[PDB]
Design an enzyme around this catalytic site. Sequence first.
Site, mmCIF file in Angstrom:
data_model
loop_
_atom_site.group_PDB
_atom_site.id
_atom_site.type_symbol
_atom_site.label_atom_id
_atom_site.label_comp_id
_atom_site.label_asym_id
_atom_site.label_seq_id
_atom_site.Cartn_x
_atom_site.Cartn_y
_atom_site.Cartn_z
ATOM 1 C CG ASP A 1 14.977 50.111 23.094
ATOM 2 O OD1 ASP A 1 16.163 50.179 23.391
ATOM 3 O OD2 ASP A 1 14.048 50.594 23.783
ATOM 4 C CG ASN B 1 16.913 46.848 31.085
ATOM 5 O OD1 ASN B 1 17.773 47.150 31.900
ATOM 6 N ND2 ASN B 1 16.990 45.776 30.332
ATOM 7 C CG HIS C 1 18.575 55.362 24.686
ATOM 8 N ND1 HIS C 1 17.199 55.473 24.646
ATOM 9 C CD2 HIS C 1 18.830 54.119 25.172
ATOM 10 C CE1 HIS C 1 16.644 54.340 25.036
ATOM 11 N NE2 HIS C 1 17.612 53.515 25.401
ATOM 12 C CG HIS D 1 19.958 50.831 25.570
ATOM 13 N ND1 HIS D 1 19.199 51.071 26.682
ATOM 14 C CD2 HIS D 1 21.221 50.698 26.022
ATOM 15 C CE1 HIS D 1 19.965 51.176 27.750
ATOM 16 N NE2 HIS D 1 21.204 50.971 27.370
HETATM 17 C C1 LIG Z 1 17.045 46.947 24.693
HETATM 18 C C2 LIG Z 1 16.669 47.494 26.067
HETATM 19 C C3 LIG Z 1 15.519 46.741 26.749
HETATM 20 C C4 LIG Z 1 15.367 45.364 26.703
HETATM 21 C C5 LIG Z 1 14.306 44.709 27.355
HETATM 22 C C6 LIG Z 1 13.364 45.415 28.054
HETATM 23 C C7 LIG Z 1 13.507 46.817 28.118
HETATM 24 C C8 LIG Z 1 12.765 47.840 28.739
HETATM 25 C C9 LIG Z 1 11.525 47.710 29.554
HETATM 26 C C10 LIG Z 1 10.493 48.726 29.347
HETATM 27 N N1 LIG Z 1 9.283 48.680 30.097
HETATM 28 N N2 LIG Z 1 9.103 47.594 31.003
HETATM 29 C C11 LIG Z 1 10.076 46.564 31.229
HETATM 30 O O1 LIG Z 1 9.812 45.652 31.990
HETATM 31 C C12 LIG Z 1 11.328 46.625 30.451
HETATM 32 C C13 LIG Z 1 13.445 49.020 28.446
HETATM 33 C C14 LIG Z 1 13.175 50.442 28.853
HETATM 34 O O2 LIG Z 1 12.804 50.576 30.064
HETATM 35 O O3 LIG Z 1 13.524 51.421 28.132
HETATM 36 N N3 LIG Z 1 14.473 48.756 27.676
HETATM 37 C C15 LIG Z 1 14.573 47.427 27.479
HETATM 38 N N4 LIG Z 1 17.831 47.463 26.995
HETATM 39 C C16 LIG Z 1 18.770 46.382 27.226
HETATM 40 C C17 LIG Z 1 19.738 46.923 28.237
HETATM 41 C C18 LIG Z 1 20.367 45.972 29.248
HETATM 42 C C19 LIG Z 1 21.735 46.573 28.936
HETATM 43 C C20 LIG Z 1 22.878 45.662 28.613
HETATM 44 N N5 LIG Z 1 23.471 45.147 29.839
HETATM 45 C C21 LIG Z 1 21.126 47.223 27.732
HETATM 46 O O4 LIG Z 1 19.077 48.087 28.777
HETATM 47 C C22 LIG Z 1 17.989 48.438 28.009
HETATM 48 O O5 LIG Z 1 17.303 49.387 28.208
HETATM 49 ZN ZN LIG Z 2 13.765 51.439 26.053
HETATM 50 ZN ZN LIG Z 3 17.283 51.836 26.700
#
Ligand SMILES: C[C@@H](c1cccc2c(-c3cn[nH]c(=O)c3)c(C(=O)O)[nH]c12)N1C[C@]2(C[C@@H](CN)C2)OC1=O
Ligand SMILES: [Zn+2]
Ligand SMILES: [Zn+2]
Length: 232
Positions: free
Chosen positions: A89, A181, A85, A87
């Site tokens: 990561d 997230n 996807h 993002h």
């Molecule tokens: C890059 C990514 C991201 C950043 C930090 C944390 C997580 C988490 C995550 C996973 N396990 N437990 C949690 O506590 C947290 C997940 C996931 O759950 O996959 N992904 C994360 N980002 C950033 C974002 C915000 C949006 C911009 N406004 C883009 O969304 C996203 O997914």
């Molecule tokens: Zn993620």
């Molecule tokens: Zn994500």
Amino acid sequence: SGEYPTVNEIPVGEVRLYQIADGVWSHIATQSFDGAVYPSNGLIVRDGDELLLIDTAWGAKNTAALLAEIEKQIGLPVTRAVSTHFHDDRVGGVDVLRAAGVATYASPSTRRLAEAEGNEIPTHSLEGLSSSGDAVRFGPVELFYPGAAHSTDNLVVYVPSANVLYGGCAVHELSSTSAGNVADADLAEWPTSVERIQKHYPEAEVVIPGHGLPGGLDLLQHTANVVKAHKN
Ligand SMILES: C[C@@H](c1cccc2c(-c3cn[nH]c(=O)c3)c(C(=O)O)[nH]c12)N1C[C@]2(C[C@@H](CN)C2)OC1=O
Ligand SMILES: [Zn+2]
Ligand SMILES: [Zn+2]
């Protein structure tokens, strides 16, 4: 020393690999985001005498370190990468990969979202994945679009030789009480998308989440539960 790595066992700025099955590894790295530190997974699948990479290591320097760790531990060239996807990561590090000769791929939906939001952009579009339930072959894996879940574009990856299901961020680890997230998620459709995964890959033996520890098929039902409870 054999356990699945966490942030406590990855030296600063480094990447660790974990053997999942014959010719299948996960990669684990850590990154900071909004003032907290998180682990994240990707996949490596042997493709003859080459390697297919699934997802970056969440950042340019982490992804450079990933390539170096693969050369040290495996010693076969990474020739293609798929980001599951849009993002950071999943795509942060694509520019590193492309400058290292890796051909980078993602769905057109991922490419559009990455471009629009200012994330790094895979070079090549993966057609044939735009409707939920679609699947296409890509070297030694099958790519599957389950529908909107953690993001509208999220893909999952199945390794048929080993019955390994890489769920990416549409799938959460068993210890999670939270849906992670959810900024770009569809909590209403997520259970339906997980049900599609469960229906399509009933023989999965290992299920790998986008963050945290692999387990078995229970990760799918657990994910549906935590998403429904979050929504509640
Ligand atoms: C890059 C990514 C991201 C950043 C930090 C944390 C997580 C988490 C995550 C996973 N396990 N437990 C949690 O506590 C947290 C997940 C996931 O759950 O996959 N992904 C994360 N980002 C950033 C974002 C915000 C949006 C911009 N406004 C883009 O969304 C996203 O997914
Ligand atoms: Zn993620
Ligand atoms: Zn994500």
